[PDB]
Scaffold this active site. Sequence first.
Site, PDB file in Angstrom:
ATOM      1  N   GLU C 156       0.838  -1.184   0.000  1.00 26.31           N
ATOM      2  CA  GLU C 156       0.000   0.000   0.000  1.00 26.31           C
ATOM      3  C   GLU C 156       0.878   1.240   0.000  1.00 26.31           C
ATOM      4  O   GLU C 156       1.982   1.242   0.545  1.00 26.31           O
ATOM      5  CB  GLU C 156      -0.937   0.014   1.205  1.00 26.31           C
ATOM      6  N   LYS C 215       8.470  -1.233  -2.138  1.00 29.30           N
ATOM      7  CA  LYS C 215       7.802  -0.523  -1.054  1.00 29.30           C
ATOM      8  C   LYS C 215       8.817   0.090  -0.091  1.00 29.30           C
ATOM      9  O   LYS C 215       8.703   1.268   0.280  1.00 29.30           O
ATOM     10  CB  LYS C 215       6.853  -1.477  -0.330  1.00 29.30           C
ATOM     11  N   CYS C 271       5.707   4.018  10.104  1.00 28.52           N
ATOM     12  CA  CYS C 271       6.477   3.218   9.154  1.00 28.52           C
ATOM     13  C   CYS C 271       7.892   3.688   8.831  1.00 28.52           C
ATOM     14  O   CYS C 271       8.808   2.861   8.914  1.00 28.52           O
ATOM     15  CB  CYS C 271       5.681   3.067   7.865  1.00 28.52           C
TER      16      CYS C 271
HETATM   17  N1  LIG Z   1      -0.100   3.129   8.319  1.00 22.68           N
HETATM   18  C1  LIG Z   1       0.209   3.325   7.016  1.00 22.68           C
HETATM   19  O1  LIG Z   1       0.137   4.438   6.521  1.00 22.68           O
HETATM   20  C2  LIG Z   1       0.653   2.152   6.143  1.00 22.68           C
HETATM   21  C3  LIG Z   1       1.221   0.997   6.652  1.00 22.68           C
HETATM   22  N2  LIG Z   1       1.609  -0.045   5.843  1.00 22.68           N
HETATM   23  C4  LIG Z   1       1.925  -1.321   6.443  1.00 22.68           C
HETATM   24  O2  LIG Z   1       0.723  -2.007   6.586  1.00 22.68           O
HETATM   25  C5  LIG Z   1       0.701  -2.737   7.860  1.00 22.68           C
HETATM   26  C6  LIG Z   1      -0.559  -2.376   8.643  1.00 22.68           C
HETATM   27  O3  LIG Z   1      -0.205  -1.338   9.570  1.00 22.68           O
HETATM   28  P1  LIG Z   1      -1.332  -0.572  10.418  1.00 22.68           P
HETATM   29  O4  LIG Z   1      -2.652  -0.906   9.858  1.00 22.68           O
HETATM   30  O5  LIG Z   1      -1.020   0.864  10.481  1.00 22.68           O
HETATM   31  O6  LIG Z   1      -1.175  -1.196  11.915  1.00 22.68           O
HETATM   32  P2  LIG Z   1      -2.265  -1.550  12.983  1.00 22.68           P
HETATM   33  O7  LIG Z   1      -1.587  -1.931  14.240  1.00 22.68           O
HETATM   34  O8  LIG Z   1      -3.273  -0.423  13.075  1.00 22.68           O
HETATM   35  O9  LIG Z   1      -3.014  -2.787  12.309  1.00 22.68           O
HETATM   36  C7  LIG Z   1      -2.723  -4.152  12.651  1.00 22.68           C
HETATM   37  C8  LIG Z   1      -4.017  -4.739  13.144  1.00 22.68           C
HETATM   38  O10 LIG Z   1      -3.939  -6.160  12.899  1.00 22.68           O
HETATM   39  C9  LIG Z   1      -4.434  -6.898  14.001  1.00 22.68           C
HETATM   40  N3  LIG Z   1      -3.750  -8.166  13.979  1.00 22.68           N
HETATM   41  C10 LIG Z   1      -2.424  -8.418  14.137  1.00 22.68           C
HETATM   42  N4  LIG Z   1      -2.113  -9.724  14.062  1.00 22.68           N
HETATM   43  C11 LIG Z   1      -3.340 -10.325  13.842  1.00 22.68           C
HETATM   44  C12 LIG Z   1      -3.716 -11.685  13.669  1.00 22.68           C
HETATM   45  N5  LIG Z   1      -2.827 -12.687  13.699  1.00 22.68           N
HETATM   46  N6  LIG Z   1      -5.020 -11.936  13.469  1.00 22.68           N
HETATM   47  C13 LIG Z   1      -5.888 -10.924  13.441  1.00 22.68           C
HETATM   48  N7  LIG Z   1      -5.664  -9.625  13.588  1.00 22.68           N
HETATM   49  C14 LIG Z   1      -4.357  -9.389  13.788  1.00 22.68           C
HETATM   50  C15 LIG Z   1      -4.063  -6.036  15.204  1.00 22.68           C
HETATM   51  O11 LIG Z   1      -4.937  -6.307  16.333  1.00 22.68           O
HETATM   52  C16 LIG Z   1      -4.241  -4.586  14.674  1.00 22.68           C
HETATM   53  O12 LIG Z   1      -5.521  -4.014  14.981  1.00 22.68           O
HETATM   54  C17 LIG Z   1       2.060  -2.513   8.499  1.00 22.68           C
HETATM   55  O13 LIG Z   1       2.988  -3.577   8.216  1.00 22.68           O
HETATM   56  C18 LIG Z   1       2.515  -1.196   7.835  1.00 22.68           C
HETATM   57  O14 LIG Z   1       3.958  -1.095   7.822  1.00 22.68           O
HETATM   58  C19 LIG Z   1       1.712   0.058   4.441  1.00 22.68           C
HETATM   59  C20 LIG Z   1       1.245   1.226   3.937  1.00 22.68           C
HETATM   60  C21 LIG Z   1       0.667   2.367   4.715  1.00 22.68           C
HETATM   61  O1  LIG Z   2       7.824  17.565   3.707  1.00 22.01           O
HETATM   62  C1  LIG Z   2       7.558  16.821   4.641  1.00 22.01           C
HETATM   63  C2  LIG Z   2       6.719  15.680   4.504  1.00 22.01           C
HETATM   64  C3  LIG Z   2       6.480  14.904   5.610  1.00 22.01           C
HETATM   65  N1  LIG Z   2       7.039  15.248   6.783  1.00 22.01           N
HETATM   66  C4  LIG Z   2       6.791  14.418   7.981  1.00 22.01           C
HETATM   67  O2  LIG Z   2       6.872  13.088   7.605  1.00 22.01           O
HETATM   68  C5  LIG Z   2       6.070  12.279   8.523  1.00 22.01           C
HETATM   69  C6  LIG Z   2       5.363  11.216   7.737  1.00 22.01           C
HETATM   70  O3  LIG Z   2       4.591  11.902   6.748  1.00 22.01           O
HETATM   71  P1  LIG Z   2       3.836  10.981   5.694  1.00 22.01           P
HETATM   72  O4  LIG Z   2       4.724  10.653   4.555  1.00 22.01           O
HETATM   73  O5  LIG Z   2       2.479  11.411   5.330  1.00 22.01           O
HETATM   74  O6  LIG Z   2       3.563   9.656   6.614  1.00 22.01           O
HETATM   75  P2  LIG Z   2       2.628   8.410   6.450  1.00 22.01           P
HETATM   76  O7  LIG Z   2       1.257   8.971   6.657  1.00 22.01           O
HETATM   77  O8  LIG Z   2       3.054   7.304   7.303  1.00 22.01           O
HETATM   78  O9  LIG Z   2       2.876   7.943   4.903  1.00 22.01           O
HETATM   79  C7  LIG Z   2       4.129   7.488   4.512  1.00 22.01           C
HETATM   80  O10 LIG Z   2       4.327   6.130   4.968  1.00 22.01           O
HETATM   81  C8  LIG Z   2       3.291   5.250   4.490  1.00 22.01           C
HETATM   82  C9  LIG Z   2       3.584   3.914   5.142  1.00 22.01           C
HETATM   83  O11 LIG Z   2       4.847   3.357   4.698  1.00 22.01           O
HETATM   84  C10 LIG Z   2       3.310   5.185   2.958  1.00 22.01           C
HETATM   85  O12 LIG Z   2       2.186   4.406   2.536  1.00 22.01           O
HETATM   86  C11 LIG Z   2       3.193   6.592   2.392  1.00 22.01           C
HETATM   87  O13 LIG Z   2       3.400   6.491   0.975  1.00 22.01           O
HETATM   88  C12 LIG Z   2       4.231   7.526   2.974  1.00 22.01           C
HETATM   89  O14 LIG Z   2       4.012   8.873   2.503  1.00 22.01           O
HETATM   90  C13 LIG Z   2       5.156  13.220   9.300  1.00 22.01           C
HETATM   91  O15 LIG Z   2       5.450  13.189  10.709  1.00 22.01           O
HETATM   92  C14 LIG Z   2       5.422  14.593   8.628  1.00 22.01           C
HETATM   93  O16 LIG Z   2       5.430  15.701   9.573  1.00 22.01           O
HETATM   94  C15 LIG Z   2       7.866  16.362   6.924  1.00 22.01           C
HETATM   95  O17 LIG Z   2       8.372  16.657   8.012  1.00 22.01           O
HETATM   96  N2  LIG Z   2       8.108  17.143   5.813  1.00 22.01           N
END
Ligand SMILES: NC(=O)C1=CN([C@@H]2O[C@H](COP(=O)(O)OP(=O)(O)OC[C@H]3O[C@@H](n4cnc5c(N)ncnc54)[C@H](O)[C@@H]3O)[C@@H](O)[C@H]2O)C=CC1
Ligand SMILES: O=c1ccn([C@@H]2O[C@H](COP(=O)(O)OP(=O)(O)O[C@H]3O[C@H](CO)[C@@H](O)[C@H](O)[C@H]3O)[C@@H](O)[C@H]2O)c(=O)[nH]1
Lengths: 459, 459, 454
Positions: C156, C215, C271
Amino acid sequence: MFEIKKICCIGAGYVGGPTCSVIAHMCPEIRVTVVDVNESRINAWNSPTLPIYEPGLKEVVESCRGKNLFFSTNIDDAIKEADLVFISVNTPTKTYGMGKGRAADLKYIEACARRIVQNSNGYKIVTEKSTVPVRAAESIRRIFDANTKPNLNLQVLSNPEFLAEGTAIKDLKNPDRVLIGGDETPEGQRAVQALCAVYEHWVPREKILTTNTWSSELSKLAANLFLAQRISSINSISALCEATGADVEEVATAIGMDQRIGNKFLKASVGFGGSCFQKDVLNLVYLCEALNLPEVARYWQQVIDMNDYQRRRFASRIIDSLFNTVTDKKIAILGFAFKKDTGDTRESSSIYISKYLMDEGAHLHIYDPKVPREQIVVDLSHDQVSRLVTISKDPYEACDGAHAVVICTEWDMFKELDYERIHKKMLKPAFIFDGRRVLDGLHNELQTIGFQIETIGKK
Amino acid sequence: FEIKKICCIGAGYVGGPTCSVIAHMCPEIRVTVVDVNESRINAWNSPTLPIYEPGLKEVVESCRGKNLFFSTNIDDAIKEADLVFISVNTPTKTYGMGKGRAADLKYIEACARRIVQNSNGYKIVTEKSTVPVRAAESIRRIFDANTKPNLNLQVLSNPEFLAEGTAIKDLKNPDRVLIGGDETPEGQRAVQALCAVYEHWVPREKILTTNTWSSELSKLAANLFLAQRISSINSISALCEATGADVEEVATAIGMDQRIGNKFLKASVGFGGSCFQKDVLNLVYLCEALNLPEVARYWQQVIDMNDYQRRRFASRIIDSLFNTVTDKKIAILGFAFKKDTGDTRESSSIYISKYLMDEGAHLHIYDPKVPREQIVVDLSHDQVSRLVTISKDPYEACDGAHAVVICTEWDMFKELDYERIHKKMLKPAFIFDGRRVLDGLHNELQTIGFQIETIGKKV
Amino acid sequence: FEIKKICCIGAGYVGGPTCSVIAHMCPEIRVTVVDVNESRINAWNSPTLPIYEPGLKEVVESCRGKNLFFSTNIDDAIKEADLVFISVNTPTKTYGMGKGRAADLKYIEACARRIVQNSNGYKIVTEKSTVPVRAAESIRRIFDANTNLQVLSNPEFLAEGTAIKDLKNPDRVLIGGDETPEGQRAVQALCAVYEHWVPREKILTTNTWSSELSKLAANLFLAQRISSINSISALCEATGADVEEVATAIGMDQRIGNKFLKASVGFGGSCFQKDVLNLVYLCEALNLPEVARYWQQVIDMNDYQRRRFASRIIDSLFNTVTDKKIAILGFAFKKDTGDTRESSSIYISKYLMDEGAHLHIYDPKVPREQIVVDLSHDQVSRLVTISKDPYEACDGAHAVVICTEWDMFKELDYERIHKKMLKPAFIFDGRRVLDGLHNELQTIGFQIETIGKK
Ligand SMILES: NC(=O)C1=CN([C@@H]2O[C@H](COP(=O)(O)OP(=O)(O)OC[C@H]3O[C@@H](n4cnc5c(N)ncnc54)[C@H](O)[C@@H]3O)[C@@H](O)[C@H]2O)C=CC1
Ligand SMILES: O=c1ccn([C@@H]2O[C@H](COP(=O)(O)OP(=O)(O)O[C@H]3O[C@H](CO)[C@@H](O)[C@H](O)[C@H]3O)[C@@H](O)[C@H]2O)c(=O)[nH]1
Ligand SMILES: NC(=O)C1=CN([C@@H]2O[C@H](COP(=O)(O)OP(=O)(O)OC[C@H]3O[C@@H](n4cnc5c(N)ncnc54)[C@H](O)[C@@H]3O)[C@@H](O)[C@H]2O)C=CC1
Ligand SMILES: NC(=O)C1=CN([C@@H]2O[C@H](COP(=O)(O)OP(=O)(O)OC[C@H]3O[C@@H](n4cnc5c(N)ncnc54)[C@H](O)[C@@H]3O)[C@@H](O)[C@H]2O)C=CC1
Ligand SMILES: O=c1ccn([C@@H]2O[C@H](COP(=O)(O)OP(=O)(O)O[C@H]3O[C@H](CO)[C@@H](O)[C@H](O)[C@H]3O)[C@@H](O)[C@H]2O)c(=O)[nH]1
Ligand SMILES: O=c1ccn([C@@H]2O[C@H](COP(=O)(O)OP(=O)(O)O[C@H]3O[C@H](CO)[C@@H](O)[C@H](O)[C@H]3O)[C@@H](O)[C@H]2O)c(=O)[nH]1
C-alpha cells in the site's frame, strides 16, 4: 632427606578427595587425612555412597578408608599433625568488584593459609592443588611470612591437578605426568623432593616433572587454554565449511593425521562447556590485563569469543530458518548437560541456546535423561521460565506438535529415536538442528521422511 | 588405467622434492619437472641443487637422467604427461585489491591456461599449490570454456604437507596423503588413478579421499593449527617473562598431556617460512568474502601474535642497548627461517634485521647455509650498503659487537666459543637468544660476564 | 475467476480504509474486515470509528452492512473468501535478535498459519503489509508444506491523513506475484478488482521480490528527502539563509520535484523509521554494510533534528526548564490524523520531561488516554497535564512548542496568549506554520524561534 609421614588435605571436593584416596591407596604407610568445612560432604565420604561419583573411586576409598585414609571434620588437628598440607578448596570467579566475572576469588585459599599458620608449628609443606592465578602461591607465602613464629618453617609448593571428569581414577593411577613446582632454592627443592617421593610410590620418575612455582601454576591454566583453543579453532572451521561446501568431519580427520597436531579435541560442536575451560580463559585474560599484556589478553580472549559465536550463530540459524520469528512456537530442546553421559550442567551450551530462544518467546520443552528438572529451572532462571519453559519427561512428548528439534547434548539415545513417529506429530515443515553431529549418517533417511535437517559443519 | 608420465609445472621447494621422491619410488613412471626459471632448472641438472634440503641430493642423483627430468620445455612436457601437477607459488598480493592479504593466483591461472592450450585427450590436472577454497572450480571453468573434441581434463587437489628441512623424510613417509575429487564417476576415476601412484610406497590406510573443497580447506586448516600452536606458546612466552615462569618448562608440562602433544611448542622470536603468514592471511581474507568476520578475527590473532613476538624481541635488544643502536655493531647469527634449510622466506631474521637497521645499527650477519647474495636481496627495498655486512664465520661477526642475536636454531651456535667471543665484544656484552638454544648454558655464560636474555625467561 | 469475496486480516490504518474503498468501488464484492481486537472491531461498527481519517467516516457508513463488514470471527471470513489480504502490523522487534532493528514477522506468521488451518480449495493470499524482501517465499514454503493457494504482493502507498484520496486516485498500484502460469493468473485476478476504479496504465506488475523491495525503497526515498531538507535547515540556521526559500528553489528543478521538502522537527509515523531500520538490518545479513550505513543516515539525521530542536528550547530558557510550564501544541505525528505513532511530540515531550518541565499538551484529534500512554512506562502524574483547549495549555507558560501542523495554530490570538504567559515569552515553531506571522509576534513581545531561521 625429609620423609612425608602424614598428609592433610583441606577441601574434600572433586579434586581434594580422589587425589588423596589414591595417595592413601598407593602409599599404605602414609596417613592421609582429608578434611573439609562442609560437614555433610565429609560425612558422605565415610558413608556407603560417595559425594562425587567416579568409576572405580568407591573401590579405592573402600580399600584404605579407616586404614590409612581418613575423612574427618576436625580440620585444626589434621593440620597441626600433618607433614604435608594440600590446599584444594575452590577459587570461584569473583561476582563483584574489580575483575567481576573473570578474576579468581582467593578468599577461600586465603582462609586456608591463615588457618594453617594459625595451627601450624615446626616444619610443614603447604601445597596448593587448586587452579590458581600465577603467583597465587606468592600470596600464601606473604601470609606465612607475615605471621611467623620461632621454629615455624612453611614451604609452599604447586601441584595442580589434571584429571578429566569421568576418568579420574585412571588419570590418577596412571598419570600422563605429575607436576610439582617449588622455589629454586635449597628449602624449595627439599620440599619438592619430599612430594616426589610420595608420587614415586606408583608414578615413574620420568613422568614426574618438576618446575619452578610459577611455571607450574601457569602450566595448569595453559593446558586448558590449548584444549579450549582446539575446540574454538575447529568450531570456526565448521563455520567456514558450511560456507564453502566442505565437510568439517572430513577436514578434522585430515588435520588430525598430522602427528604434530594430533586427533584429540577436534570434534566440532555447538560450543564447549564445563566448570573449567571458560573460567580458566577469563582468569588468564584478566591476569594479562593486570600485567600490561593486552596483546596476549586479546589473543586468548578469542577462545571465548569464538565459543560465544558458535553458540549464538546456532541460535541464529534456528530463528532464521523458522521464517525469522519463533515467538509462541513450540521447540524441542534435546539434551541439557554440557556433555553427554553426565548430569553436570555447568556452562552447558544448552543453557545459552535455550536462553537465546527464550528471549524470542519460543515455548521450549526440554528433555535430559539424567539432569534433574529442578536444576534446569535454576540454570534458566534469574519468572520468564514459567511462561516459556517446560521440562518434558520423555523425548517424544517434547517433539509433539513442535516446529523444530534442537539437539544440544550428544546423548547416544538421541541417535536411536523414532523419527518416523516424531515427524507425523510435528508441525510442517519439521526442522532438525543437530548441534552435536549425533545424526551423522542418518541424513538421507531423514530428508525423505520430510524432516528438514541442518547440522554444524555441513551445508 | 595407469598414470605413466607426470609433469610438474614448478620446480621449487615443492615440485622438485615431491617429484624426485615419486621417480625414486616409481621406476616405471616418467617424471618431468618444468619451470620458467632457467637458472633453477640448470641448478637442478647440476651437482649443486638450487635448494638445500637434507637428503634431496641423493634422491635426485638416484634417478635423474633415468625417469626424472628437469626442463624449461613446459609445453612439450604438458603434452606428453598423463598427470600434470600445478606446483607454482601463491604469494600474498603486494598490490591491487586485497594487497597484503589476498592470495595472488596469477601463477595458477597461467598454468591452467597453458595446460588447456597444450592439451588433447585425457589428462589429470592436480593442484598441489596452496590455494583459496573453491580455487579448483576456477581451473574447472577455464577448462570447460576451452574444451575441444576429445579433451577430457579432470581436476584434483593434492595439497602438500612436507616441511622444509625434513622434506625427504616427510615425502618418503608421510603421515597422510590427501586427494580431493569430484563425487562424480569421472572424478573417482581421477582420484583412484592418483591413489595408485602413491600406493607404490604409501600404505592405503594413510591415503585420504575427500571432495575438492574439503581437501583445499584441510591444507589451510592444517597450517593454521600449526601456526596457532606457535603463536600460543609465544603468547605464553611473554607471560613467562612477566611472571617469572619459564616457557620451556610450561611447554614441557603442557606437551605431556597426550591430547595436546609435545610437537610445535618451541617458543621463538617468530615463525617464518613462505607459507604460514600468507595462508592465514588468505583464510582471513576469504572469511571476509563470505561474511564470516568472527572467524576472520579469530585467526587474524595468529599473525598479530607473531608480529608482536617479533616487535617485542627487537625492542628488548634496543631497550637493553639504551635505546640507541646507532653505529653499534650487532651480530646476527642465523638468517634462515628455520634450521636445515637455505630458505629465508619470511624469516624473522629479516624483520629483526630491519628493526635494527631502522635504528642505524651495524649488522654483521652470519648463516651457515644461506647464500650471501640472498641476504643482501632480502634487506634491500642503500641502507644495506651503509649498515649490512655478511660475515664469513661467526667469530668475525661477534668481533667488536655489542650483542649477539641468535635468530635461527642452527646446531652450531650452541657450540661456539663464547669465552673467546666475550674477550673481543664491547662491554657490557649481550646475547639475545631468540630460539632457546643456549638453554642451560646461562649460568656459565653469566660467569663469563655475558648478559643473556632469551624468549620466555624473566630477566 | 472474478474475485467475489474478500477477507482482510487486520482492521487497522490499512485494512480498514483499503477495504472500505474496495467496497465503495466494487458493489458486487463482499468485503469482510476482521481482527482479533474485539474493541477495534466494535468501534469500526460504531458512529465513532477507531481512527481519524478525513473522508473515512463517509466511506464506511456508505457500505457497512451492504458489502462492508467488520467481524471478530476470523475463521469463517477466510473460509468463504476468494482473496485474503494480510494487513497486520509489522513493528520493530523490541526483543531477541535484532532488537530495535529487525521487523517482527510474528503477526504475519500468525495469518499464514490460520489461513491454511481454515481454508479449502482455491484462494489468493495477498501480502499488503510492508515485509522484507523474500518474505513472500516464506508464506509459500508454509503453504507448500501443510498441503491450492497462491501468494501475491500488493503493498500500500496510502499516507495517513490523505488515505481516502490516495486510495481513490492512486499514483500506481503495485501487484507482485509468481512468474509462473499459476501466478500470472492470480495477478490479473487482483488487477480486475483494482481495474474497477484504477486505470490500467497505473497498475504495475512485477515479481514478488521486486514488489516487496519497491515498497521499502520508496519509503527510503521519501524519508531521505525530509532528512535531507532537515539537514539543510541546520545549515540555514548557521548561515542566515532560509530553509523555505532554499527548499522552494530546490523544488523548482523538475527532476527533484517540489514535494516532501518541508523542514520539520522530525518525521514521525508508524512506518518510515521502522522501514529504514528494517532495510539496514536486512543489509547486515546480506553483507552490505555500505548500503546499511548509507540509509542509516536517514535515521541519525531525524534523531539529530529532534534533539537539536529539544536543546533549542532548553538552551533558550536560560538553560534550565525544571518546574517551568511549557505548552505542547500538536501531539499527532502529522496533521489530519489522530495517530501518534512515532510522533516527534513524544520525543520532544520526553526530552522536556527529563528536565523536569511541567507539560501541558493539546491536540484536536488525539484522545487524552493515548498521550498519557505514549508518555509513560509515576513520572507522568507529576509532570504531564492534558489540556482541553489550547489557551489553557499556554496559561502561565514560559514557552509554546508547536510540534504538529494543525492549520488552527495560526488562528490563535497571540495577543491573548502573550498577556497570560510568564515573561520573557517564547514560541518554538517546529512546523514553520507561523511564517509571516513573525513581525506580529515580535512586536507583541514574543521571542519566536523556528526551524531553518538564524
Ligand atoms: N499506516 C500506514 O500508513 C501504512 C502501513 N503499511 C503497512 O501495513 C501494515 C498495517 O499497519 P497498520 O494498519 O497501520 O497497523 P495496525 O496496528 O493499526 O493494524 C494491525 C491490526 O492487525 C491486528 N492483527 C495483528 N495480528 C493479527 C492476527 N494474527 N489476526 C488478526 N488480527 C491481527 C491487530 O490487532 C491490529 O488491529 C504494516 O505492516 C505497515 O507497515 C503500508 C502502507 C501504509
Ligand atoms: O515535507 C515533509 C513531509 C512529511 N514530513 C513528515 O513526515 C512524517 C510522515 O509523513 P507521511 O509521509 O504522510 O507519513 P505516512 O502517513 O506514514 O505515509 C508514509 O508512509 C506510508 C507507510 O509506509 C506510505 O504508505 C506513504 O506512501 C508515505 O508517505 C510526518 O510526521 C510529517 O510531519 C515532513 O516533516 N516534511
Ligand atoms: N572440577 C575439576 O575438574 C577440577 C578442579 N580444579 C580446581 O579445583 C577447584 C574446585 O575443586 P572441586 O573439588 O571441584 O570443588 P569443591 O567446591 O567441591 O571442593 C572444594 C571444597 O573446599 C571446601 N572449602 C572451601 N573453602 C574452605 C576453607 N576455608 N576451609 C575448608 N574447606 C573449605 C568447600 O566447602 C568444598 O567442599 C577449581 O576451582 C580448580 O581450582 C583443578 C582441576 C580440575
Ligand atoms: N615451500 C613449502 O614448504 C611448501 C609450499 N607449499 C605450496 O606449494 C606452492 C609452491 O611453493 P614453493 O615451491 O615453495 O614456491 P617456489 O616459488 O619455490 O616455486 C614455484 C616455482 O614455480 C615457477 N613458476 C611460477 N609460475 C610459473 C609458470 N607460469 N610456469 C612455470 N613455472 C612457473 C617459479 O619460477 C618457481 O620456480 C605454494 O602454493 C605453497 O603454498 C605446500 C607445501 C610446502
Ligand atoms: O572433541 C571435543 C571434546 C570435547 N568437547 C567439549 O569440551 C567440553 C569440555 O570437556 P572436558 O574436557 O571433559 O571438560 P572437563 O571435564 O571440565 O575437563 C577439562 O578441564 C579439567 C580442569 O582443568 C582438565 O583437568 C581436563 O584435562 C579438561 O579436559 C565439553 O563441553 C565437550 O562437549 C568438544 O566440543 N569437542
Ligand atoms: O615449535 C615451533 C615450530 C616451528 N617454529 C617456526 O615456525 C616456522 C615454520 O616451521 P615449519 O613448520 O617446520 O616450516 P615449514 O617448512 O614452512 O613447514 C610448514 O609449512 C609447510 C607449507 O605449508 C607445510 O607443508 C608444513 O606442514 C608446515 O609444518 C619456522 O620459522 C620455525 O622456526 C617455531 O617457532 N616453533
